[PDB]
Scaffold this active site. Structure first.
Site, PDB file in Angstrom:
ATOM      1  N   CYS A 276     -26.028 -72.690 -52.206  1.00 49.16           N
ATOM      2  CA  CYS A 276     -27.303 -73.191 -51.700  1.00 49.16           C
ATOM      3  C   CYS A 276     -27.818 -72.460 -50.458  1.00 49.16           C
ATOM      4  O   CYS A 276     -29.005 -72.130 -50.375  1.00 49.16           O
ATOM      5  CB  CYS A 276     -27.219 -74.707 -51.436  1.00 49.16           C
ATOM      6  SG  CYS A 276     -25.716 -75.299 -50.621  1.00 49.16           S
TER       7      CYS A 276
ATOM      8  N   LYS B  73     -19.098 -67.181 -48.058  1.00 50.81           N
ATOM      9  CA  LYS B  73     -20.023 -66.921 -49.156  1.00 50.81           C
ATOM     10  C   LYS B  73     -21.263 -66.168 -48.700  1.00 50.81           C
ATOM     11  O   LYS B  73     -21.946 -65.541 -49.512  1.00 50.81           O
ATOM     12  CB  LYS B  73     -20.439 -68.233 -49.823  1.00 50.81           C
ATOM     13  CG  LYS B  73     -19.286 -68.997 -50.459  1.00 50.81           C
ATOM     14  CD  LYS B  73     -19.762 -70.273 -51.133  1.00 50.81           C
ATOM     15  CE  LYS B  73     -18.595 -71.018 -51.756  1.00 50.81           C
ATOM     16  NZ  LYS B  73     -19.017 -72.245 -52.485  1.00 50.81           N
TER      17      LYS B  73
ATOM     18  N   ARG C 173     -23.181 -79.019 -40.765  1.00 51.13           N
ATOM     19  CA  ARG C 173     -23.700 -80.136 -41.535  1.00 51.13           C
ATOM     20  C   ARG C 173     -24.502 -81.008 -40.580  1.00 51.13           C
ATOM     21  O   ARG C 173     -24.010 -81.375 -39.513  1.00 51.13           O
ATOM     22  CB  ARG C 173     -22.549 -80.945 -42.109  1.00 51.13           C
ATOM     23  CG  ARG C 173     -22.971 -82.004 -43.100  1.00 51.13           C
ATOM     24  CD  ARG C 173     -22.413 -81.662 -44.456  1.00 51.13           C
ATOM     25  NE  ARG C 173     -23.307 -80.819 -45.230  1.00 51.13           N
ATOM     26  CZ  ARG C 173     -22.925 -80.074 -46.261  1.00 51.13           C
ATOM     27  NH1 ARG C 173     -21.656 -80.053 -46.640  1.00 51.13           N
ATOM     28  NH2 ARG C 173     -23.825 -79.374 -46.933  1.00 51.13           N
TER      29      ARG C 173
ATOM     30  N   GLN D 100     -27.358 -77.763 -42.444  1.00 51.98           N
ATOM     31  CA  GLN D 100     -27.246 -78.194 -43.831  1.00 51.98           C
ATOM     32  C   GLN D 100     -27.303 -79.690 -44.143  1.00 51.98           C
ATOM     33  O   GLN D 100     -26.723 -80.522 -43.438  1.00 51.98           O
ATOM     34  CB  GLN D 100     -25.992 -77.556 -44.447  1.00 51.98           C
ATOM     35  CG  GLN D 100     -26.056 -76.027 -44.475  1.00 51.98           C
ATOM     36  CD  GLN D 100     -24.803 -75.383 -45.036  1.00 51.98           C
ATOM     37  OE1 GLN D 100     -24.360 -75.719 -46.131  1.00 51.98           O
ATOM     38  NE2 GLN D 100     -24.231 -74.445 -44.292  1.00 51.98           N
TER      39      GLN D 100
END
EC number: 1.2.1.11
Lengths: 367, 367
Positions: free
Chosen positions: B135, B244, B267, B162
């Site tokens: 994402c 990633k 987060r 996020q």
């Protein structure tokens, strides 16, 4: 004993300062005089075991009688009173939380655990105006002080997650209230296990954009969102918040060569803690262990959080830091860009080191 | 008509996919077969119009009979089923949202608006496995695709904000429930104009640490807080979410020279939108109006929000983006470190371009 006057001690920042001073019994060594605009003549808060009466914050004669003035009243007040006092020949000490005087040539931005040297020199050189630095820069330097003190910083790129307390008391309430609206709107389905998340999210997303949410203070919603723009827009494209990073960091450290400091200042849904993400360019390849050593050695408040998942989740968060004097630093490691690229994530309570604490510590030195 | 099997179409990501396919009427040109791990043999939904029945998601024979498999089931599923079907000689098309096969040499990470060229090549070079990207990376590339397409990126430092949907439907409900607890705990005080903000805050701060907040999914509280660590801890001190960044960006873009991409994945208290702060180093001093043109011209979803206060506040936030396909970029300007340093802030919906959309589009290419 020094006669110290307090202005705006009933405000949010002022209240924290009072709490802290009581806690450290800072009122014993001084003769406190509490100023106001309202309940004049009425008994002072008696925090300093004092049984005096509230003075007129706008009575110049009363202010001039002071040896030191500590204000958390704001920039409008500082802008009206400060020049009248200085021009009238008042040479007492002015300790301020407002940004107004930060960049004046005869004022020092105070963050003693970081710049006591600058402070002492100025003191010995006739500087009588000491201003607290911006919450963001203050928290950053308290956490990464060891790096700067060792002159290891080439430049700093920041991304902030700023708490509502930076806006003020009304802003904080607005954030909590919106949390109330959002949850209350889907309270039932949340209580129904079989309820569909997309149904729940659909309703909250709709309510957020509906216009029903109270957004007087922030302009747009904050709970469940964020706002990538803090205060006045500048010609170079920075917001005044982003602009302060370089100006204040360099003035506080009293650098000779300008250290580039820039990034994006974002307001997030937290109450008092500012968290900052850093991409720091070191001048030489220093090892992480060495880096953790310098950082932890600079001051006792810069708690270095090991770069391990579990402890990070526990200690490097607003949840863990709110209300404390701790300004932790974690997620320290080199970035793929190179061995000279260091990452760091800090968290810190905006009202303590980011506002009241530096003021309290300075008074102590003058007491 | 290709026979397309759908796996996990009832999960959250799968539900968004089903919703989008219906909106665009993607079921008309294909023969949908719906699978389940639960009750099999029962009727099929009428989204596909079909009068079929739910098949067995673990029935290799039923799966072998398909031309294409679109699963939002997850890594566990994929790791078991996929290698079996490939071993049994199945050469059909496998479209996956799970990260399991992303880095396999026989698979391509799909985000057609950005790497259609690559999807076509492999689509001609025998590639039969297409996997959606992380994402964070998908959204970054959708917003910043123009700078990459024009080979202007040296490296990229990121700081993310996020959303909980990335964790799951349980995480999202947990976040909202937590907002309810925090607010309820001080509901009466907030309703009392005269209440003290510090009392209100003290209560919330204590509740947050009381252990009374439901934290089964995030481990620690999220509402009013944030967590600077996402997913498994790597040996390089990087988290898998952070890993990633470079891994997937380069594979997606199929770079001939590794472009360093790194930073911190955090987060935050958002439901569906991921926002990201960037420090991008350009290969050459490019003007902002140019950069603006390059980004807006790469794809129609990369909306360029002018670097101005009001619109930024109204258009570059989770509140303005949740549920849309728009992946805005704003706050574009040069950083203090030099003319080759570009700042950028983006917002994107985690469930659409970050999950369901690339699958839907790939499926449509193969029908």
């Amino acid at each position: 004993m020094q006669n110290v006057g307090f202005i705006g001690w009933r405000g949010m920042v002022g209240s924290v300062l009072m709490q802290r001073m009581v806690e450290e019994r800072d009122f014993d060594a001084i003769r406190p005089v509490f100023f106001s605009t309202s309940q004049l003549g009425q008994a002072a808060p008696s925090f300093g075991g004092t049984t005096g009466t509230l003075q007129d914050a706008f009575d110049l004669e009363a202010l001039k009688a002071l040896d030191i003035i500590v204000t958390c009243q704001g920039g409008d007040y500082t802008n009206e009173i400060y020049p009248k006092l200085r021009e009238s020949g008042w040479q007492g000490y002015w300790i301020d939380a407002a940004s107004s005087l930060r960049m004046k040539d005869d004022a020092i931005i105070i963050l003693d655990p970081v710049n006591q040297d600058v402070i002492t020199d100025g003191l010995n050189n006739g500087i009588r105006t000491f201003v607290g630095g911006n919450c963001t820069v203050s928290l950053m330097l308290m956490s990464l002080g060891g790096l700067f003190a060792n002159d290891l910083v080439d430049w700093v790129s920041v991304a902030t997650y700023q708490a509502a307390s930076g806006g003020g008391a009304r802003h904080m309430r607005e954030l909590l209230t919106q949390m109330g609206h959002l949850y209350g709107h889907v309270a039932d389905e949340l209580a129904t296990p079989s309820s569909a998340i997309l149904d729940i999210e659909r309703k909250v997303t709709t309510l957020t954009r509906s216009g029903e949410l109270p957004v007087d203070n922030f302009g747009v919603p904050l709970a469940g969102s964020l706002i990538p723009w803090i205060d006045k827009q500048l010609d170079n494209g920075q917001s005044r918040e982003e602009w302060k990073g370089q100006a204040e960091t360099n003035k506080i450290l009293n650098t000779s060569s300008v250290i580039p400091v820039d990034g994006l200042c974002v307001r997030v849904g937290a109450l008092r803690c500012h968290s900052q993400a850093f991409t720091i360019k070191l001048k030489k390849d220093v090892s992480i262990p060495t880096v953790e050593e310098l950082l932890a050695a600079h001051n006792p408040w810069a708690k270095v959080v090991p770069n391990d998942r579990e402890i990070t989740m526990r200690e490097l968060t607003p949840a863990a830091v709110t209300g404390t004097l701790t300004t932790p630093v974690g997620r320290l490691r080199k970035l793929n860009m190179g061995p000279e690229f260091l990452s760091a994530f800090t968290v810190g309570d905006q009202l303590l080191w980011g506002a009241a604490e530096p003021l309290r510590r300075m008074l102590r030195q003058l007491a």
